[PDB]
Amino acid sequence: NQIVSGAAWTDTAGNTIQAHGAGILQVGSTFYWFGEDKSHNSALFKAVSCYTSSDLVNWSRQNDALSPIAGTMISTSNVVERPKVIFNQKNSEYVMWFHSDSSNYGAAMVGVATAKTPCGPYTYKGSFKPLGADSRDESIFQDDDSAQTAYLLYASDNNQNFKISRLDANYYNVTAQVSVMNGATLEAPGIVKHNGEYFLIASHTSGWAPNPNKWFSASSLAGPWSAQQDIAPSATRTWYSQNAFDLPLGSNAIYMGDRWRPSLLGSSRYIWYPLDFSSGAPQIVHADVWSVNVQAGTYSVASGTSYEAENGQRGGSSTILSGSGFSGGKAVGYLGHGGTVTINNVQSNGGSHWVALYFANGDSTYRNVTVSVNGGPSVLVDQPDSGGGNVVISVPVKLNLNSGENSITFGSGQSNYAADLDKIIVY
Ligand SMILES: *[C@@H]1O[C@H](CO)[C@@H](O[C@@H]2O[C@H](CO)[C@@H](O)[C@H](O)[C@H]2NC(C)=O)[C@H](O)[C@H]1NC(C)=O
Ligand SMILES: *[C@@H]1O[C@H](CO)[C@@H](O)[C@H](O)[C@H]1NC(C)=O
Ligand SMILES: *[C@@H]1O[C@H](CO)[C@@H](O)[C@H](O)[C@H]1NC(C)=O
Ligand SMILES: OC[C@H]1O[C@@H](O)[C@H](O)[C@@H](O)[C@H]1O
Ligand SMILES: OC[C@H]1O[C@H](O)[C@H](O)[C@@H](O)[C@H]1O
Ligand SMILES: [Ca+2]
C-alpha cells in the first residue's frame, strides 16, 4: 500500500480521514496520528482524532483523543489546532499540547491535556499564554538527552516573532525562553534532530494559502540558527502544502503537510513526502506514490512511465502551450469547453493504477478535468490552483486500466476550462 499525496484518504472503515494539523507519536511500532477533525467544514473545535497504523498507509480510527467541553476554552465555539503528543517517562503519561484560541485568533494560547494511554481519551487541564506571551501555531519537540527535555516551538507576538522555549519536567508548563527569531513571521513549525543537529521546518505567514516552507539548523536550540533555505522549489509553494509534522525515518525523515481547502475545510488533503537528508539538509522528494519500510527505516519511490500531453491527439479547440515550467517545454491548453486531448498507447498490466496528472492552473480557485479510460464512463479530477500558468504541480487519480494498451481522454463534456495538462505519469 502506498502514500499518495493529495488523494482522498479513507480509514479502514472507509470513512474520510479527519486529522489535519498532524501530530505523530510512535509507541512500539505503531504510529498514532492525532489531528483536527474537520468533518463539519469548520475551523471551530469538533475533536482531536486518533488514528493508528503499522505502515503509515492503512489507518484505523480509534476513539477521539480530545472532545469539546462547553463553557471552557475548548468549547465548540473555540479553536483547537495542531495537536502534538509526547510521552513523559517520569510520570508514565502522554501529554498533548495544542494551539488554543478564539474564533478570531485573538486569544493566542496553548492548551494541555493528559492521558495514560496513547489515544486516551485525554483530560484537558487548561489553556495559557507561554510566559504571558502569544502562542498561535505551535509544535512540541522532545530531545534525545537522558532527561528527554521537551520544548515548545511557537509563533508569538501576533505571529511576528518565532520562539523556542523549554518545558518543565512534567511537560505541563513553559518555563524558560531558549531562542527567538524576531521578525521572522514563521508558523507551522516542526523540528527533526538529524546527525546531532536541530533542523527547524516552518512556513511563513499567509493564512490558509500555501507558501515556500523553509529549513533552519543549529547545534543548540538556543541558536545561532542558519538563515532560511527552501525545502522545495519555491514556485510550487511546498508542492501546495503547509508543514504539519516532520517525522524521523532512518537516516532521513518524512514531511507531513496539509493542503488546506478553506472553502471546504473537511476536504483539506494530506501531502506526505520523503524528506531526503542526503545533501546534509532536508529536501522534499516530490514522490507521487511511495512507501515506507518501517523496520529498515527506509522509503521507496514508485517508478512510473511518463507521457507528454502535447504528444497526444488533440480534439476540438485545445491548443499547444509553450513554457519553461513544463516537461518538454510544452503543455496542452484550452482543455475542456470543447477541447480534448487523448493519450494513446499507455501500456499497463491493468487493474487499479495511480496516474499522476501534471498540470498548471494560474487561477486562484480550483479547476477540474474529466477523464475517460478506453471510452469508459467519465470521472472528474480536481485541479487545485498551482501558483501560476508556468508552475506545474500534480494530483493523483486511481484509474482502472486494461491489461495491454490503453487510451485516456481528457476534457470531454465539461463546459468549464480544465487546467493546462503538461504530462501524466502512470504508476
Ligand atoms: C470544476 O471546476 C469549475 C471551475 O473550472 C468549478 O466551477 C466554478 O464553481 C464555482 C463554485 O464553487 C463558481 O463560483 C464558479 O463561477 C465556477 N467557475 C467556472 C469557471 O465555471 C466547478 O464547481 C468544479 N466542479 C466541482 C465538482 O468542484
Ligand atoms: C489494515 O489494518 C487492519 C487493522 O490492524 C488489519 O486488520 C488489516 O489487515 C490491514 N490491511 C492490510 C491490507 O494490511
Ligand atoms: C509557568 O511558568 C512560568 C514561568 O516560570 C510561571 O510564571 C507560571 O506561573 C507557571 N505556571 C504555572 C501554572 O505554574
Ligand atoms: O481562460 C481559460 C484559459 O486559461 C488560461 O489560464 C489557460 O492557460 C488556457 O489554456 C485556458 O484554459
Ligand atoms: O488561521 C487559519 C490557519 O492559518 C494557518 O494556515 C495556520 O498554520 C493554521 O493552523 C490556521 O490557524
Ligand atoms: Ca509536457
272 and 313 part of one domain: no
The conformation of residue 310, written as its DSSP 8-state character, comes to G
> Which of 135, 166, 173 shows the shortest CA–CA distance to 150?
166
- CB atoms near residue 363 (< 10 Å): 13
Q: Residue 426: phi, psi to the nearest 5? A: -100, 120
Spatial CB neighbours of 233, under 8 Å, sequence gap ≥ 6? none
Of the candidates 49, 17, 56, 57, the residue with the CA atom closest to the CA atom of residue 269: 17
What is the identity of the amino acid at 272?
Answer: W
Q: Are residues 289 and 369 in the same domain?
A: no
Q: Is the CB of 163 under 6 A from ligand 1?
A: no
Residues contacting ligand 4 via CB (< 6 Å) = 333-334, 362, 389, 417, 420
User: Of 232, 367, 290, 218, whose CA–CA distance to 55 is shortest?
Assistant: 290
How far is the centre of ligand 3, averaged over its atoms, from the C-alpha of 112 (Å)?
Answer: 14
Cβ burial 178-212 (10 Å sphere, 16+ → b, else e): bbbbeebbbbbbbbbebeeebbbbbbbbeeeebbb
Q: Are residues 387 and 345 in the same domain?
A: yes
Give the domain-ending residue among 301, 318, 342: 301
List residues, by chain if needed, whose CB lies under 5 Å from ion ligand 6: 308, 326-328, 330, 422-423
| Residues contacting residue 191 through CB under 8 Å, at least 6 positions apart | 139, 141, 151, 153, 198, 199, 200, 201, 246
Could you tell me which of 240, 241, 192, 239 has the C-alpha nearest to residue 215? 192
- As a whole number of Å, the end-to-end CA separation of the chain is 13
CA–centroid distance, residue 371 to ligand 4 (Å): 18
* Cα–Cα distance measured from residue 250 to residue 54, given in angstroms and rounded to the nearest whole number: 16
Strands 150-156, 161-167: parallel, antiparallel or unpaired by DSSP? antiparallel
SS3 assignment, position 386: coil
Sheet holding 109-115, edge to edge: 79-88, 93-101, 109-115, 123-128
* CATH code of residue 394: 2.60.120.260
Q: Which three cell numbers stand for residue 124?
A: 484537558
Q: Are residues 345 and 292 in the same domain?
A: no
Do the bridges between strand 420-426 and strand 305-308 make them parallel or antiparallel, or are there none, so unpaired?
antiparallel
| Residues 321 and 245 both lie in one domain | no
Alpha-carbon dihedral sign for residues 244, 296, 395, 379:
negative
Helices (H), 88-161: none
Spacing, Cα 189 to ligand 6 middle (Å): 35
Best probe residue, ligand 1, of 263, 337, 368 (max atoms within 8 Å of C-beta): 368
Q: Do 294 and 314 belong to one domain?
A: no
Q: Is 416 in the pocket of ligand 1 (CB under 6 A)?
A: yes
Map residue 200 onto helix, strand or coil. strand
Q: Is 258 annotated as a binding residue?
A: no
Residues 6 or more apart in contact with residue 58 via CB below 8 angstroms:
1, 12
User: 58: Cβ below 6 Å to ligand 2?
Assistant: yes
Apex 174 CA angle, 172 and 176, nearest 5? 145
CA triplet 173, 69, 47: central angle to 5 degrees? 85
What is the SS3 assignment for 225? coil
Beta strands 290-293 and 79-88: pairing type? unpaired
Pocket of ligand 3 contains residue 173 by CB under 6 Å: yes
Ligand 2: centre distance to CA 57 (Å):
10
Resolution in A: 1.5
Distance CA 274, CA 251 (A): 11
Phi, psi angles (nearest 5°) of residue 413: 80, -20
d(C-alpha 275, C-alpha 252), whole Å: 6
Q: Are residues 38 and 121 in the same domain?
A: yes
The dihedral over CA atoms of 178, 182, 188, 189, expressed in degrees to the nearest 10, equals: -30
- Shared domain for 228 and 265, answered yes or no, is yes
90-106 b/e (C-beta count within 10 Å ≥ 16 → b)? eeebbbbbbbbbeeeee
Q: Pocket of ligand 2, candidates 58, 59, 61, 352: which has the most ligand atoms within 8 Å of its Cβ, to mutate? A: 58
Rounded CA-CA distance 103/18 in Å is 20
47 shares its domain with 182:
yes
Question: Does the annotation list 137 as a binding residue?
Answer: yes
Q: Which residue, 255, 284, 301, sits at the end of a domain?
A: 301
d(CA 244, CA 255): 8
Are 86 and 112 members of one domain? Answer: yes
Residue 126's DSSP bridge partners are: 112
Ligand nearest to the CA of 136: 5
Query: Three-state SS string across 167-185, please?
Result: ECCCCCCEEEEEEEECCCC
Query: Distance between CA 180 and CA 164 in Å, rounded?
Result: 6
Atom 11 (ligand 4) nearest CA? 334
81 is in an annotated binding site: yes
What's the CA-to-centroid distance between 380 and ligand 6, angstroms? 21
Q: β-strands 392-410, 283-284: how paired?
A: unpaired
> Are 174 and 311 in the same domain?
no
User: Residue 169: left (phi > 0), alpha (psi -120 to 50), or beta?
Assistant: alpha
User: Residues with Cβ < 8 Å from 14, sequence gap 6 or more?
Assistant: none
Per the structure, the count of domains in the chain is 2
What is the domain-level CATH number for residue 53? Answer: 2.115.10.20
Give CA–CA dist 410/344, Å, rounded. 12
Query: Residue 82, annotated ligand binder?
Result: yes
For residue 295, report the distance from its CA to the centre of ligand 5, in Å.
Answer: 34
- Technique used by the depositors: X-ray
All three cell numbers of 329, joined, read 517545454
Which of 251, 391, 409 shows the shortest CA–CA distance to 326?
Answer: 391
Residue that is written with C-alpha cell 479527519 in the block: 18
Domain that holds residue 310: 305-426
8 Å CB contact between 154 and 137: yes
CB 98 within 8 A of CB 83: yes
Residue whose CA is closest, atom 2 of ligand 3?
175
Q: What does 234-293 look like in DSSP terms, one character per residue?
A: GGGHHHH-EEEEEEEETTEEEEEEEE--TTSGGG-EEEEEEEE-TTSS-EE---SSEEEE
> Mutation test of ligand 5: which of 136, 139, 153 has the most ligand atoms closer than 8 Å to its C-beta?
136
Q: Among 301, 334, 357, where does a domain finish?
A: 301
Give the dihedral of Cα atoms 201, 204, 210, 215; nearest 10 deg: -20
